[PDB]
Amino acid sequence: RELAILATAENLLEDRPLADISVDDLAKGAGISRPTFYFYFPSKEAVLLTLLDRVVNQADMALQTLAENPADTDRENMWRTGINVFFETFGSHKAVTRAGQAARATSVEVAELWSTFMQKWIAYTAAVIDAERDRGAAPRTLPAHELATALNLMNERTLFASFAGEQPSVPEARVLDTLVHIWVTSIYGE
Amino acid sequence: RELAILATAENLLEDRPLADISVDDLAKGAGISRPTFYFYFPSKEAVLLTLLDRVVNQADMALQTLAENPADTDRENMWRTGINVFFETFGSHKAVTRAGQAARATSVEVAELWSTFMQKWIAYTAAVIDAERDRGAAPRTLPAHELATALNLMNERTLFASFAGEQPSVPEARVLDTLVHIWVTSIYGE
Ligand SMILES: CC(C)N1CCC2(CC1)CC(=O)c1cc(-c3ccc(C(=O)NCc4ccccc4)cc3)ccc1O2
Ligand SMILES: CC(C)N1CCC2(CC1)CC(=O)c1cc(-c3ccc(C(=O)NCc4ccccc4)cc3)ccc1O2
Numbered sequence: 001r002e003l004a005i006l007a008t009a010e011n012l013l014e015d016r017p018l019a020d021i022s023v024d025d026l027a028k029g030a031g032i033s034r035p036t037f038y039f040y041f042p043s044k045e046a047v048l049l050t051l052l053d054r055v056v057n058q059a060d061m062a063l064q065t066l067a068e069n070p071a072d073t074d075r076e077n078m079w080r081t082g083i084n085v086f087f088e089t090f091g092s093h094k095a096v097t098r099a100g101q102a103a104r105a106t107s108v109e110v111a112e113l114w115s116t117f118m119q120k121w122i123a124y125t126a127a128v129i130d131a132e133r134d135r136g137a138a139p140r141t142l143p144a145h146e147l148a149t150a151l152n153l154m155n156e157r158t159l160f161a162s163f164a165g166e167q168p169s170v171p172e173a174r175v176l177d178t179l180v181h182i183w184v185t186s187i188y189g190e
Numbered sequence: 191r192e193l194a195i196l197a198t199a200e201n202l203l204e205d206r207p208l209a210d211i212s213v214d215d216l217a218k219g220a221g222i223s224r225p226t227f228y229f230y231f232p233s234k235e236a237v238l239l240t241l242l243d244r245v246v247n248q249a250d251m252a253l254q255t256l257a258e259n260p261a262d263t264d265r266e267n268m269w270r271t272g273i274n275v276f277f278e279t280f281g282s283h284k285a286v287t288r289a290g291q292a293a294r295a296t297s298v299e300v301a302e303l304w305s306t307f308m309q310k311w312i313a314y315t316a317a318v319i320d321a322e323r324d325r326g327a328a329p330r331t332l333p334a335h336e337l338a339t340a341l342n343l344m345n346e347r348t349l350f351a352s353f354a355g356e357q358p359s360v361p362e363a364r365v366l367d368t369l370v371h372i373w374v375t376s377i378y379g380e
Contacts, residue, residue, distance in 0.1 A: 105295055115356075118358050142371050149358050149359065150369065154340060154344035154348070157344065157346060157347035158339075158344070168339050168342070169343075171336075175340075181337070182340055182376040185375045189374075189375030
């Protein structure tokens with residue numbers, strides 16, 4: 001029933017925003033009463049928070065698997081494989097991504113959830129850039145953590161604008177090549 | 191009196207969000223009645239739209255002046271000078287920038303205003319990258335317009351996160367050097 005509320009909410013977010021979705025709409029869809037819904041979730045906001053949490057953790061766990069299982073290819077394809085975890089994971093959950101992003105303005109818990117994982121992904125990127133510099137593969141240019149921060153923020157804004165079909169945006173079919181180019185040139189360039 | 195409403199609103203946005211500012215608060219501050227306020231502006235939303243419009247046009251006009259008056263320095267400093275128009279202009283109007291950005295979620299007019307200028311600044315960046323490639327200064331890598339789009343979206347997200355003191359963010363004293371590095375390496379790198 002928890003899963004049916006989550007699936008119903010993800011389905012309804014494809015067609016319209018959270019503002020335009022009611023607890024009644026969510027309960028109706030999961031085959032339960034308004035009061036039974038409130039046993040599982042304090043609000044329609046708490047339902048989005050859970051969905052965004054699953055997407056963010058799915059992305060995180062897939063990046064952990066990648067880190068532990070290095071791909072055997074040139075650095076450019078190694079980087080593409082990694083940026084692709086975020087392209088595929090968030091790109092398979094566009095509605096939750098769109099509404100998760102809006103909800104950062106209004107929800108302290110969503111803002112904190114996003115803040116914690118971005119800190120984690122930036123720190124991993126900084127550690128990878130430092131390891132590439134120690135092994136002599138990348139030159140010592142910007143502070144690694146400041147470079148990693150800007151490249152992660154770029155990816156957040158650029159992936160999400162592509163997913164939303166925003167004007168302006170990189171066409172979704174071109175966004176992965178675009179971000180890999182900028183990571184590789186900015187990390188390895190003198 | 192229009193100017194006094196605008197100045198009052200900019201002042202009040204330093205201390206709290208638009209949601210927490212009333213028409214009465216804006217009228218009080220400009221030394222006028224609620225009804226006299228509504229002669230000048232249909233809403234507190236229309237007041238933000240005007241303020242964001244002044245900032246965006248101040249940025250645009252400063253970039254036009256730069257384009258017409260090339261700085262006489264190496265390419266790296268030419269690019270820094272340009273990114274600095276956005277750093278200084280939006281950085282001198284942090285509260286309007288912060289609330290202008292939030293208001294994109296809720297205001298079609300703010301979303302369209304932002305969309306028009308980003309299209310204009312991306313097109314200028316694409317034309318500059320193409321001119322650098324025609325003169326043999328930059329290699330033909332990514333489509334210029336897709337590169338320009340990603341670099342402009344990076345700058346929007348990275349400048350605004352710095353201004354807001356977001357976690358995570360590039361410290362404001364480091365953000366200009368960070369974006370110039372990534373523009374120069376991604377535009378001139380092979
Ligand atoms: C060549 C060798 C030295 N590398 C190859 C790559 C790897 C191991 C060592 C393995 C990997 O996969 C990898 C991945 C990231 C990464 C990618 C993208 C984001 C990213 O886009 N985050 C912003 C974001 C968040 C949420 C929504 C949208 C955007 C973050 C980190 C960094 C470093 C890596 O090292
Ligand atoms: C070396 C020679 C070939 N160039 C030198 C630079 C120049 C002439 C030719 C002159 C210039 O000043 C210049 C500036 C931009 C520019 C910079 C930043 C943004 C930018 O950050 N926009 C996103 C944004 C919007 C609003 C808030 C925050 C961020 C856009 C365009 C591009 C191209 C230029 O050509």
